[PDB]
Each structure stands twice: as structure tokens, then as C-alpha cells.
Scaffold this active site. Structure first.
Site, PDB file in Angstrom:
ATOM      1  N   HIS A 196       0.033  -3.822  -2.391  1.00  0.00           N
ATOM      2  CA  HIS A 196       1.329  -3.686  -2.759  1.00  0.00           C
ATOM      3  C   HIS A 196       2.313  -4.547  -2.620  1.00  0.00           C
ATOM      4  O   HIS A 196       2.917  -4.975  -1.700  1.00  0.00           O
ATOM      5  CB  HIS A 196       1.388  -2.404  -0.804  1.00  0.00           C
ATOM      6  CG  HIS A 196       2.045  -1.914  -1.328  1.00  0.00           C
ATOM      7  ND1 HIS A 196       3.638  -1.402  -0.900  1.00  0.00           N
ATOM      8  CD2 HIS A 196       2.141  -0.131  -0.473  1.00  0.00           C
ATOM      9  CE1 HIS A 196       4.191  -0.049  -0.299  1.00  0.00           C
ATOM     10  NE2 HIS A 196       2.635   0.864  -0.655  1.00  0.00           N
TER      11      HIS A 196
ATOM     12  N   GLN B 237       4.854  -4.561   4.981  1.00  0.00           N
ATOM     13  CA  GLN B 237       5.966  -3.385   5.810  1.00  0.00           C
ATOM     14  C   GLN B 237       5.404  -2.878   7.502  1.00  0.00           C
ATOM     15  O   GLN B 237       6.437  -2.626   8.141  1.00  0.00           O
ATOM     16  CB  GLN B 237       5.907  -2.318   5.139  1.00  0.00           C
ATOM     17  CG  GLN B 237       5.981  -2.225   3.726  1.00  0.00           C
ATOM     18  CD  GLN B 237       6.979  -0.879   2.881  1.00  0.00           C
ATOM     19  OE1 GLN B 237       5.919   0.022   1.865  1.00  0.00           O
ATOM     20  NE2 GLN B 237       8.128  -0.104   3.832  1.00  0.00           N
TER      21      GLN B 237
ATOM     22  N   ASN C  96       0.591  -0.096  -5.985  1.00  0.00           N
ATOM     23  CA  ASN C  96       1.395   1.232  -5.598  1.00  0.00           C
ATOM     24  C   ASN C  96       2.556   0.846  -5.910  1.00  0.00           C
ATOM     25  O   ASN C  96       3.373   0.035  -5.895  1.00  0.00           O
ATOM     26  CB  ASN C  96       1.635   1.040  -3.926  1.00  0.00           C
ATOM     27  CG  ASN C  96       2.615   1.219  -3.143  1.00  0.00           C
ATOM     28  OD1 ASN C  96       4.096   0.991  -2.627  1.00  0.00           O
ATOM     29  ND2 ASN C  96       2.349   2.572  -3.255  1.00  0.00           N
ATOM     30  N   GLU C  97       2.791   2.097  -7.180  1.00  0.00           N
ATOM     31  CA  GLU C  97       4.172   2.535  -7.283  1.00  0.00           C
ATOM     32  C   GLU C  97       4.737   1.384  -8.568  1.00  0.00           C
ATOM     33  O   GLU C  97       5.467   0.761  -8.391  1.00  0.00           O
ATOM     34  CB  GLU C  97       5.315   2.518  -6.546  1.00  0.00           C
ATOM     35  CG  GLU C  97       5.240   3.255  -5.836  1.00  0.00           C
ATOM     36  CD  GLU C  97       6.260   3.498  -5.124  1.00  0.00           C
ATOM     37  OE1 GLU C  97       6.912   2.994  -5.162  1.00  0.00           O
ATOM     38  OE2 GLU C  97       6.255   4.915  -4.175  1.00  0.00           O
TER      39      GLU C  97
HETATM   40  O1  LIG Z   1      12.394   2.100   0.449  1.00  0.00           O
HETATM   41  C1  LIG Z   1      12.621   3.092   0.882  1.00  0.00           C
HETATM   42  C2  LIG Z   1      11.749   3.739  -0.530  1.00  0.00           C
HETATM   43  O2  LIG Z   1      12.175   2.878  -1.746  1.00  0.00           O
HETATM   44  C3  LIG Z   1      11.582   3.663  -2.954  1.00  0.00           C
HETATM   45  O3  LIG Z   1      12.008   2.912  -4.266  1.00  0.00           O
HETATM   46  C4  LIG Z   1      13.438   3.140  -4.884  1.00  0.00           C
HETATM   47  C5  LIG Z   1      12.884   4.265  -5.609  1.00  0.00           C
HETATM   48  O4  LIG Z   1      11.630   5.504  -5.499  1.00  0.00           O
HETATM   49  C6  LIG Z   1      12.916   3.841  -6.776  1.00  0.00           C
HETATM   50  O5  LIG Z   1      12.522   3.967  -7.987  1.00  0.00           O
HETATM   51  C7  LIG Z   1      14.385   2.571  -7.831  1.00  0.00           C
HETATM   52  O6  LIG Z   1      13.986   1.620  -8.299  1.00  0.00           O
HETATM   53  C8  LIG Z   1      14.997   0.632  -8.261  1.00  0.00           C
HETATM   54  C9  LIG Z   1      14.707  -0.518  -8.065  1.00  0.00           C
HETATM   55  O7  LIG Z   1      14.389  -1.586  -6.570  1.00  0.00           O
HETATM   56  C10 LIG Z   1      16.046  -1.736  -8.031  1.00  0.00           C
HETATM   57  O8  LIG Z   1      15.598  -2.969  -8.481  1.00  0.00           O
HETATM   58  C11 LIG Z   1      16.070  -1.444  -9.379  1.00  0.00           C
HETATM   59  O9  LIG Z   1      15.114  -1.902 -10.510  1.00  0.00           O
HETATM   60  O10 LIG Z   1      16.481  -0.130  -9.765  1.00  0.00           O
HETATM   61  C12 LIG Z   1      15.734   0.919  -9.640  1.00  0.00           C
HETATM   62  C13 LIG Z   1      15.890   2.143  -9.672  1.00  0.00           C
HETATM   63  O11 LIG Z   1      16.349   2.234 -11.112  1.00  0.00           O
HETATM   64  O12 LIG Z   1      13.842   1.532  -5.810  1.00  0.00           O
HETATM   65  C14 LIG Z   1      14.296   2.741  -5.005  1.00  0.00           C
HETATM   66  C15 LIG Z   1      14.577   1.676  -3.680  1.00  0.00           C
HETATM   67  O13 LIG Z   1      15.111   0.803  -3.850  1.00  0.00           O
HETATM   68  C16 LIG Z   1      10.285   3.515  -3.433  1.00  0.00           C
HETATM   69  O14 LIG Z   1       9.426   4.039  -4.363  1.00  0.00           O
HETATM   70  C17 LIG Z   1       9.521   3.488  -2.111  1.00  0.00           C
HETATM   71  O15 LIG Z   1       8.139   3.091  -1.606  1.00  0.00           O
HETATM   72  C18 LIG Z   1      10.457   3.836  -0.410  1.00  0.00           C
HETATM   73  O16 LIG Z   1      10.028   2.060   0.217  1.00  0.00           O
END
Ligand SMILES: OC[C@H]1O[C@@H](O[C@@H]2[C@H](O)[C@@H](O)[C@H](O[C@H]3[C@H](O)[C@@H](O)[C@@H](O)O[C@@H]3CO)O[C@@H]2CO)[C@H](O)[C@@H](O)[C@H]1O
Ligand SMILES: OC[C@H]1O[C@@H](O[C@@H]2[C@H](O)[C@@H](O)[C@H](O[C@H]3[C@H](O)[C@@H](O)[C@@H](O)O[C@@H]3CO)O[C@@H]2CO)[C@H](O)[C@@H](O)[C@H]1O
Ligand SMILES: *[C@@H]1O[C@H](CO)[C@@H](O[C@@H]2O[C@H](CO)[C@@H](O)[C@H](O)[C@H]2NC(C)=O)[C@H](O)[C@H]1NC(C)=O
Ligand SMILES: *[C@@H]1O[C@H](CO)[C@@H](O[C@@H]2O[C@H](CO)[C@@H](O)[C@H](O)[C@H]2NC(C)=O)[C@H](O)[C@H]1NC(C)=O
Ligand SMILES: *[C@@H]1O[C@H](CO)[C@@H](O)[C@H](O)[C@H]1NC(C)=O
Ligand SMILES: *[C@@H]1O[C@H](CO)[C@@H](O)[C@H](O)[C@H]1NC(C)=O
Ligand SMILES: *[C@@H]1O[C@H](CO)[C@@H](O)[C@H](O)[C@H]1NC(C)=O
Ligand SMILES: *[C@@H]1O[C@H](CO)[C@@H](O)[C@H](O)[C@H]1NC(C)=O
Ligand SMILES: *[C@H]1O[C@H](CO)[C@@H](O)[C@H](O)[C@@H]1O
Ligand SMILES: *[C@H]1O[C@H](CO)[C@@H](O)[C@H](O)[C@@H]1O
Lengths: 542, 542
Positions: free
Chosen positions: B173, B71, B220-221
Site C-alpha cells: 500500500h 497511514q 492497493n489502487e
Molecule cells: O486520500 C483520500 C483518497 O485519495 C484517493 O486518491 C484520489 C483519487 O482517487 C485519485 O484518482 C487521484 O489521483 C491523482 C494523483 O493523486 C495525483 O498525483 C495526480 O496524478 O492526479 C491524479 C488524478 O488524475 O488522487 C486523489 C487524491 O489525491 C485514494 O484513491 C483514496 O484511497 C484516498 O486516499
């Protein structure tokens, strides 16, 4: 109908006709009208400063909202109304001057005003600022009077008072009769017909409503209005001898006269007992900008020039010594007509009340190419103020940081400058004193990109608008208690998303949202409306 | 073997090659580096409330910022780095998955880290959270090691400590080596090679840096990451029988196993005296929402299910009883590999510290068609949580008002839910206890339409991000003193506008603006950066 009226609307609608709203029938407010539920109780947390605890506005303080006839009403052809310059402008140049909108329908307040007042009553608003569409009263600007037009506002005033809303009237809010523009150039009249026609209009509305409306403004923001007269459509019809650089200062002179003559009529009407006694002025705007580099004589000079051109040119003849600021006459010369002795008799002292549309305070940087060089060049982009007028200067310290939060970039003139309110009010009330005190007649926010939100919950939690109003009201309250300002009220622009002139319905200044995608234009409260209501609850007498 | 890196990078650059930044040397920071001037002193007021007065964070509290390798670094091919799955994705599906961006260059932090840290030091930041690009260490994920990659982060870590920044390291990450995905699938490995490859990788970085980096997060997450494995490019190569869905939960297990095995190695390295003693965990995210209708048994059930699928599925094995949440076991399981006792032997207790990316708190509405019918239909759009997951529900009370301020609509998952932070910290520390306490490991704001501003002064006065950061820090501060939470630090996402995954550089999370329209990607401080700085002065130890 009269044929000249039909000809004017045929003219306006030659490219596209006036659109008719979904619903066109005075609505009735059911006694059981259900408001949408309140926001979370925590939403209003920490908006207020502890610095204002227990403080109340004076008894009788006007705590209210502002709209303008052509901006909120719609019903552009209903019940005999004639076309204004803005109906023509936006029906002919919609794509280059009006962002592809027109004021045909707007928020439809012409037919929905009873519902709006009911919703305003729910928030504890106690004052309603409105403008009269001149063309609803004189469809050709002069000549025959339209009884349906006079009667609409009769009904408007009664419902508002029924909902606890004290009505405050602006006679002219920029909706120039198209007819008068074609006939003789309207506010560019090199004669005095525009004054005669305006005073007749003002006399009629004073006689009709002066028994019910006790606070009056002749003109809304005349400097902004006259500066528009440099553009279309006014510059399709300039009289002989009139430029597009002086269309602004001929307008300035004609407006000062129209105000003075109208105030005399108003005062004669009061002194004869024909109408209840009230107060009359006009609404100023802009400010007396802070120097970019404090103590620098150049920044101070450009700050003074700004005040004089943006406030003093109208406020000094009326509330001050009775003449234009000295810096204006010296720079503009014969483009600005000299005040005859009769003119000063009407204009000087023709303001019972001062009113300031205190949206913001700017920063003044003296022109980098020199003020003396700039004042001598009408073609200079910074003439006539001869500060740097563009955004990267007018809002920015030498440090590179802004004076405060910026609003939507399409309304880039707008910033949150609450810390400077008290200073402006001390300056205005000491320089342009009025026996009736000073109103904060218009302040409000355009939340950035609010027109791009598509889901209502994202719209209604409007944090930056909600804290602007709180910042501004808080400084207003301290101006009363710490500075002794004779502040008569606070009116926010506006109660609904409406038609914001060249920006159309895209720009959202409302503390209520208006669903343009709903034939009913259904209404819904933003967080900022509840912040406004609560500030009223905490700091008004009851 | 070889350095068949070329085969991999050719694949990535098959449609268009990796772009090279204008600066590809290590910058040197002049001792006289002049920072841009501070904002007006009359800023930052009304953010810090009276309620958190006199309160201090604990001694040693990590008051810092967070970034991630792919990033912020750029230099996607510099000094031997191998390609990640994101390098592949954005060079092949730029128009549909990456908003027409790629991470080739980003903020160019790979080369500008000395200046970035000098600027962070100017704000008094004392902690720097970062991740290591696995592909800089093992360009093919496994096999030959890139000494230049290991040596780069030596220089970063030494410079960070030089600027007063305690380094906090994240091993992974989301930048999966493309080669490992192609060879045998990533985290969809039906065998156990991915665990072996990750552990080999984690060991190398632990040995090289453990004397300098004393706080570690493995993943990470991971819940968010494993949900990504349901998309491209992971689903070009599933090793059946792995279908989309069956992709999120094979990953969860492989990651849990990878985490547990790596933490064991970390403990052997400390216990053998190879590296300084430190603490290790992983960063959780999401939240245990609030029921839309309080006391309603259905809303409470879908909220619990939400916590379980978004936090418990990883957190209960690691910090709790060592198994999946019961609701998770009951709904998935036939897709989720069972945690063996040997697995549980590594996983249970493998977190000295908890970390929560506490961006927000949601609202849980039970599925309108009944939770019981949703859980038994893998094809329901609300499976498996079986709350109403869409935005008009997840953020909205039955009243229709939002839980709080919404951010940019392209990151609509994000809301300002400061009032619920303390409630979240109690649930997490009582349910997933860790001896080292809990980190607030990411939080930050995407200011609405900040990417559409064209003038710097309009960007840098970021009122709602400033608000968001102060609101959250204030609640963190209140969480320590009123609730006795063992909170170990507060890390803001992010210090610079970076590359947000699929949104690319369009979304602005920095408290510094990065002018991506520069050859130098010059940084300028926003108001929130000084707000973060001001809070540290007021509430930190130092
Ligand atoms: O970039 C901004 C921010 O994004 C965060 O993720 C968001 C939500 O926290 C996360 O739950 C969600 O998950 C999505 C996934 O991305 C999709 O592919 C699909 O599976 O649906 C999910 C939700 O049920 O994504 C969100 C952003 O797309 C990050 O946690 C944070 O670190 C930031 O990067
Ligand atoms: O919601 C609309 C908002 O408009 C505000 O006017 C702004 C400034 O106050 C005013 O000084 C400025 O003047 C402009 C004029 O409009 C332009 O046509 C052009 O000629 O340049 C002038 C400056 O040289 O206009 C601003 C908006 O464009 C009102 O003050 C406010 O009350 C609102 O009505
Ligand atoms: C008549 O008024 C028009 C439109 O209001 C003026 O149009 C502007 O023209 C200048 C000079 O080209 C442009 O830079 C502006 O952008 C136009 N303004 C907008 C946005 O409407 C026009 O100049 C005026 N005509 C005369 C007589 O000069
Ligand atoms: C503005 O009005 C439109 C049209 O009424 C709304 O769109 C409808 O929303 C209702 C919600 O009850 C749905 O049942 C309809 O299906 C929607 N119509 C469409 C276009 O499919 C829209 O939601 C309103 N916007 C706001 C902010 O209230
Ligand atoms: C594969 O991934 C894409 C997104 O990357 C997604 O649209 C598609 O639905 C996924 N699943 C399937 C069915 O392949
Ligand atoms: C995926 O497989 C599961 C079993 O692993 C099955 O029940 C589900 O219906 C499949 N769905 C698809 C094809 O996406
Ligand atoms: C499962 O849900 C889909 C819609 O998501 C629905 O159409 C299908 O009929 C459902 N099947 C059953 C029997 O629940
Ligand atoms: C970014 O830098 C470019 C070139 O120096 C400049 O034109 C632009 O104004 C800068 N962006 C902002 C908004 O500061
Ligand atoms: C308002 O005007 C409309 C015209 O479309 C009528 O249909 C309606 O009955 C009302 O008079
Ligand atoms: C990398 O090094 C080059 C010179 O080789 C500099 O010009 C650049 O600013 C950066 O320090």
C-alpha cells in the site's frame, strides 16, 4: 434634506462612508427570465419519511420564507433613510463587532426584490415575511415622515402579491433608530418616550399597509433583541441609573409596553374598519429545554428557568396570566419594572397569534455550583438561568453525545433537533394559547464552512440544510395530524444568503446562494430550495 | 552486507528526526473496558430507507474496515523498520508535499491495535483490512529480513482473530523501500530487479501468514500509485530514458508483472500445501463515469477512455482478455512496455477476486477542444483521457448541478454518488469477471471542515458521513438482491482518522475520531460508527 439627518449620517460615516451597490435602479423582471436548471431527479431521494405520505397541511397554510429589512435590503442611505444603531456599530467597530462587514448593501433586496419574488414564485412559496426599516419611515425615529420610505414598501407589497406571495409584516426587526438612542437611550428609556415614538411609527405603518397586510408581528425575537442591549453601541449611552446588566430588563419592560399599546391601536383600527381585520402577536424563540438527566429536579429547575427567561418573560404577560414568570421576578428584583394596572390592560391578551422561531431545542444542565448559589450571584457566568449555558453542556447529554447534528460552529446555538418540535408546540400552545393558533416563524440552517467553498456545484448540493428543512417540516406536519396543533404556517430563515448580524455575510442561512463576488449579486438556487419547493408540492392543497 | 539502515534513516532525518510517540509499548485491554455511551436512540433514522427492508447480505459477507500500514501505524522506525519513500518525502518536503505532517506517529496503531480491535468488536465488525509495511519485513526492500517485523504482524493477526475480525491482507500500500528507489529506481526499473525484489518480499509474507490470512490483495489502487511515481521523490532518481509521463507507464507494467509473478507464487504455495487455500486479487479504484450529455458520442468516448486509463489498463490484463485496452494501446504504447506472452502467462487470470475502491462515480465531458486533438497532444492538460478533467466539469451536469453531495474541498474528487453504485458493479463484474466475486474494498467520507471543529460533541455527530455510509451500504445490499451481484464484502475507509498522504492528519476519514491533540491519541466513536454497526445488526448474518 433636514440637517439633523445629515449630521447623523456624517457621524456614522466618519471612519468610512456608506458603500453604494453596483446597481441602484429598481430592476425589471423580463417575462422570459430563465431559471437555472433543476437538480438531478435522484437528488431529493429518501429525504422524506414514509410516515407523512398523503398528509396535507390545512387549507390556507402559510408556506413561506423570512427576511428582515436591515438583513436583506442594502440601500442604507437610499431615498431618505436614516441610520440605525447597526449602521453606526459596523461603520465604527467593524473589526471587533461585525466581522468586517456592514449592512450597506447586503443582498441588495431593496432594488432586487422583483427578481427575488419571481424566483420565489418558481419554487411555489406562498408567503413572504419581511420587516420594515423604521428609519425608512422616520429617519430620525420621530418627527418627520419620509414619504419615499412609505412608498418603497407600497411597491414591495404589490409585487409580492403579484408573484403569489402573501405579505406578512414585522414592524421592528432590531434596526433601532440611531437618533432615538442618542436622544434618550431608546429602549433603555427610563421614561416612556420610546413607547410614544414606537406607537406613532406603528400607527403610520398600520394605517398605510393594514388594508393589504393581514398578519402582523410587532417585534422580532424580543428576548434576543433585548439581550443585545447589554452590548455596544447601546452601552455608550445608558441613561442615569441604568447598568449594562439591567439594560436587558428595562428593555424587556419597555418592549412589552410598546407591544400592548400598538396592539390596542391595531385593534382600534380594525374595529373602526379603517384597515382589514387581521391578527397580531410577536415572534418568540428559544425553547423549554429537556433536562440532561431525566427526573432530576435540578435539571428540571434549570429547564424551567430557561423557559421563563427565554420565552416566558415576554410570552406570559401577553398570552398567559398577564404577569412575568415567578422565577424571573424573584431573581431580578427591581431591575425589572412592575406592571402597572394600565400596562396589564394593554399587554395581557395583546396577542391574536403566537409565533415561535423554532430553530432548536437545547439541553439544560443545572449549574454545577448549585442553582441557589448561582441565582444569588449576578457575576456568576450562568446567571440568571443558572443552568450551564456553554456549548459543551447546552447541547450534550451526560453520555457525551449531542442532542442532534450541529451546524456551523460560528452559529453554535444552532442544531438540528427535529424530534423535539412536536413537544415544543404542545408546550407552547397549552401555556401561551392564542386564538389565531401558532406559527413556525423561523427555522433554517447554516451549513458548516459553506462560506469557504469556491465552486458553485459544491455549494448548491447542500445536504445538511436540505434535510434540516425536511426534518422540521415533517414534524410540523405530524403536529397537525397527530397532535391537532392549530399551526398556521412555516417560514424558513432565509431565502437568500444575507447579512447575519455580527457574523455579516460570512454566515450562510439561505436556500439560495448570493454571489458576493458578483457586482450583480446574481442568484442561484441551492438543493435545499428545491426540497422546500417539493415538500410544498407534496403537502399543500391545490 | 549489513544493516546500513542507519545510512538510510540518517538521510531521512537529515532535516529533522523521526518523532517518538508518547506510547511505545503494546497496550493491554482491561476485561472491564468501558466504552463511551451510545448516542441517543432517536438517531440513525431516515438513513436506512424502506426499500432495503428485510434484505440480508450473504452468509460469510465481510463487513469490515480498511486501514494501511503507513497511514495508521506510526512507529516509523520501531523494531527495525526501514524507511519508505514517504518517510523521506515528508521529512524533506513537509511544507510543500505533506501539509506539514509526517507518518512518524500517526494514530500509533502499531502499539494500540489491541484496544482498536476491542472497540471494533464492540461495534460488531467482523473483517479487518490492512497492509504490510514492506520495509518492516525487508528494511532495505531486499536482502536481510527483519524477524521483528514479521513477528509484529503475527501478534496483530492473532489479536484481530481474537476480537472476531477476519484478517484481510494487502501486500503493498504505496510504502516503497527508499533504498530500492535509490539503488535502481522503484517501479521505474528498466530491468526486472523490482519484480524479483517484490516477489521475494511477497513470498515471505505469504509463507508466514497464509494459514491465517485467506483473502489477499497484491497492490492497493495501482493506477493511483503509478501516477504518484510521476511526482517527488520518485522523479529525483528516474533512470532515463524515463520522463515524468514515461514514469507512470513503466510503473504500470512493472506492477502488472510484479502482481502476476507474486500471484503465481501464491498459487504454488497453496497447491504445495504450505498455506491454507485462499483468494488473491488487487484493489481497483475510480469508475466508469456517466456522459454529461446522454446519447452524445463524444461524451461516451471520453467516458470509455476514462475507464480504460483508470481501470482497464490494469484490469483488462488481469481479469479480461490479457492485454491493455485498445484506446490505451492506441494513445500510449510507445511509453508502455508490451506484455509478453510469458508476461500474459502470469498476468491473465491472476485475480480470483475483484475489489473496487468505489468512492464515487464521475461525469465525463468530452474535451471542449475535441478528443481527437487532445489525444495527439501529450502537452494538453486533458491528455490522455481527453475528457474535461477539472472539477467544474468532472462533477457537473450541463445543467450546472452536481452529480451529488461534495465532501471536504481538499478531497474534492470525493462525492456521494450512491445512486450509481449498482450500475458500476454491473459493468465491473460483466467486464472483469472473477470467480470469487467482487469486494467493495474501500469507501468513506471526508466530512467538510471536520478538522476545524474544537468540541467533541460537534465532531461526533457526523450527519453526512453517516449518510454516505448508509447510502452506499444500502445500494450494495440492493445490488446483491436486485442485480444478483456476487458481492463478497463491504470495507469502509476508515475506522480512525488517519494520515492521508499529502494532506496528513488534517483530513478526517474515520468513523472514530482520533484526538491527535492527546498524548494517548484517545479514540471516540462517531455517529457513523454506530450507523455502520446498526446496519450490520439489521442486515448481516453473524
Ligand atoms: O486520500 C483520500 C483518497 O485519495 C484517493 O486518491 C484520489 C483519487 O482517487 C485519485 O484518482 C487521484 O489521483 C491523482 C494523483 O493523486 C495525483 O498525483 C495526480 O496524478 O492526479 C491524479 C488524478 O488524475 O488522487 C486523489 C487524491 O489525491 C485514494 O484513491 C483514496 O484511497 C484516498 O486516499
Ligand atoms: O442567523 C442569526 C440567528 O441568531 C439567533 O440568535 C441566537 C439565539 O437564538 C439567541 O438566543 C442568542 O442570544 C445571545 C445574543 O445574541 C448575544 O448577543 C449574547 O448577548 O448572548 C445571548 C445569549 O446569552 O443569540 C444567538 C446568535 O448569537 C436567532 O435566534 C436567529 O433567529 C438568527 O437571527
Ligand atoms: C459594551 O458592549 C460591549 C460590546 O458589545 C461589551 O463587549 C464585551 O465585553 C466583554 C467583557 O470584556 C468581552 O468578554 C466580550 O467578548 C465583548 N463582547 C463582544 C464580542 O462584543 C462590553 O462589555 C459592554 N460594555 C460594558 C459597559 O460592559
Ligand atoms: C461569482 O461571480 C464571479 C465573478 O463573476 C465568478 O467568477 C467568474 O466566473 C465566470 C464564469 O462564467 C468566468 O467566466 C470568469 O472568468 C470568472 N471571473 C474571474 C474572477 O475570473 C464566479 O464564478 C461566481 N461564483 C459562483 C459560485 O457562481
Ligand atoms: C517532479 O515532481 C513534482 C511534484 O513532486 C512536480 O511538481 C514536478 O512537476 C515533477 N515533474 C518534473 C517536471 O520534474
Ligand atoms: C517524455 O518522453 C516522451 C517519450 O517517452 C516524449 O514524447 C515526451 O514529449 C517527453 N516529455 C517530457 C520531456 O516531459
Ligand atoms: C498543444 O496544447 C498546447 C496547450 O496545452 C497548445 O498551446 C499547443 O499549441 C498545442 N499544440 C497543438 C498544435 O495542438
Ligand atoms: C482532546 O483532548 C484534549 C486534552 O485531553 C482536550 O482538551 C480536547 O477537548 C480533546 N478534543 C476533543 C475535541 O474532544
Ligand atoms: C442609483 O444610484 C447611482 C449612484 O451611484 C446612480 O449612478 C444610478 O443612476 C442610480 O440612480
Ligand atoms: C505500554 O506499556 C506501558 C508500561 O511499560 C504502559 O504504561 C502503557 O500504557 C502501554 O501499555
Amino acid at each position: 434634506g433636514t440637517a439633523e439627518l445629515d449630521a447623523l449620517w456624517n457621524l456614522v460615516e466618519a471612519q468610512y462612508p456608506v458603500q453604494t451597490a453596483a446597481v441602484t435602479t429598481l430592476v425589471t423582471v423580463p417575462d422570459d427570465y430563465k431559471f437555472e436548471a433543476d437538480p438531478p431527479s435522484y437528488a431529493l431521494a429518501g429525504y422524506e419519511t414514509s410516515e407523512i405520505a398523503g398528509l396535507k397541511f390545512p387549507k390556507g397554510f402559510k408556506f413561506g420564507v423570512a427576511g428582515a429589512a436591515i438583513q436583506v435590503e442594502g440601500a442604507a442611505k437610499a431615498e431618505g433613510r436614516g441610520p440605525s444603531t447597526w449602521d453606526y456599530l459596523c461603520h465604527h467597530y467593524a473589526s471587533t463587532q461585525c466581522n468586517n462587514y456592514d449592512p450597506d448593501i447586503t443582498t441588495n433586496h431593496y432594488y432586487l426584490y422583483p427578481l427575488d419574488f419571481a424566483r420565489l414564485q418558481h419554487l411555489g412559496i406562498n408567503t413572504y415575511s419581511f420587516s420594515i426599516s423604521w428609519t425608512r419611515i422616520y429617519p430620525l425615529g420621530a418627527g418627520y415622515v419620509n414619504e419615499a420610505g412609505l412608498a418603497h414598501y407600497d411597491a414591495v407589497i404589490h409585487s409580492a402579491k403579484k408573484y403569489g406571495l402573501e405579505p406578512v409584516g414585522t414592524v421592528f426587526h432590531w434596526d433601532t433608530p440611531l437618533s432615538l438612542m442618542l436622544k434618550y437611550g431608546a429602549w433603555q428609556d427610563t421614561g416612556d418616550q420610546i413607547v410614544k415614538d414606537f406607537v406613532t411609527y406603528a400607527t403610520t405603518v398600520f394605517k398605510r399597509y393594514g388594508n393589504e397586510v393581514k398578519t402582523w408581528f410587532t417585534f422580532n425575537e424580543p428576548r434576543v433583541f433585548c439581550s443585545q442591549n447589554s452590548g455596544l453601541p447601546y452601552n455608550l449611552t445608558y441613561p442615569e441609573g441604568i447598568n449594562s446588566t439591567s439594560a436587558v430588563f428595562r428593555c424587556t419592560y419597555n418592549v412589552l409596553k410598546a407591544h400592548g399599546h400598538a396592539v390596542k391601536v391595531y385593534r382600534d383600527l380594525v374595529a373602526s374598519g379603517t384597515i382589514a381585520a387581521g391578527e397580531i402577536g410577536f415572534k418568540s424563540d428559544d425553547n423549554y429545554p429537556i433536562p440532561a438527566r431525566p427526573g432530576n429536579a435540578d435539571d428540571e429547575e434549570s429547564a424551567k428557568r430557561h423557559e421563563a427567561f427565554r420565552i416566558g418573560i415576554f410570552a406570559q404577560p401577553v398570552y398567559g396570566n398577564g404577569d412575568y414568570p415567578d422565577v424571573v421576578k424573584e431573581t431580578v428584583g427591581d431591575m425589572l419594572p412592575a406592571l402597572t394596572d394600565e400596562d396589564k390592560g394593554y399587554i395581557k391578551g395583546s396577542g391574536d397569534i403566537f409565533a415561535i422561531d423554532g430553530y432548536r431545542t437545547d439541553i439544560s444542565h443545572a449549574a454545577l455550583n448549585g442553582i441557589a448559589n448561582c441565582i444569588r450571584n449576578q457575576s456568576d457566568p450562568n446567571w440568571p438561568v443558572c443552568e450551564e449555558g456553554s456549548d459543551p453542556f447546552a447541547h450534550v447529554y451526560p453520555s457525551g453525545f449531542a442532542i442532534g447534528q450541529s451546524a456551523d460552529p460560528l452559529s453554535s446555538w444552532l442544531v438540528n433537533s427535529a424530534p423535539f418540535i412536536r413537544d415544543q408546540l404542545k408546550f407552547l400552545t397549552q401555556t401561551y394559547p392564542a386564538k389565531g393558533g401558532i406559527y413556525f416563524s423561523a427555522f433554517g440552517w447554516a451549513e458548516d464552512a459553506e462560506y469557504d467553498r469556491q465552486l458553485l456545484y459544491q455549494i448548491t448540493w447542500d445536504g445538511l440544510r436540505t434535510q434540516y428543512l425536511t426534518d422540521y417540516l415533517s414534524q410540523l406536519l405530524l403536529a397537525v395530524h397527530k397532535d391537532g396543533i392549530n399551526l398556521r404556517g412555516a417560514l424558513t430563515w432565509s431565502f437568500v444568503d444575507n447579512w447575519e448580524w455580527g457574523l455579516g455575510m460570512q454566515q450562510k442561512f439561505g436556500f439560495q446562494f448570493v454571489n458576493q463576488s458578483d457586482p450583480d449579486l446574481t442568484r442561484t438556487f441551492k438543493l435545499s430550495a428545491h426540497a422546500y419547493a417539493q415538500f410544498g408540492r407534496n403537502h399543500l392543497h391545490h
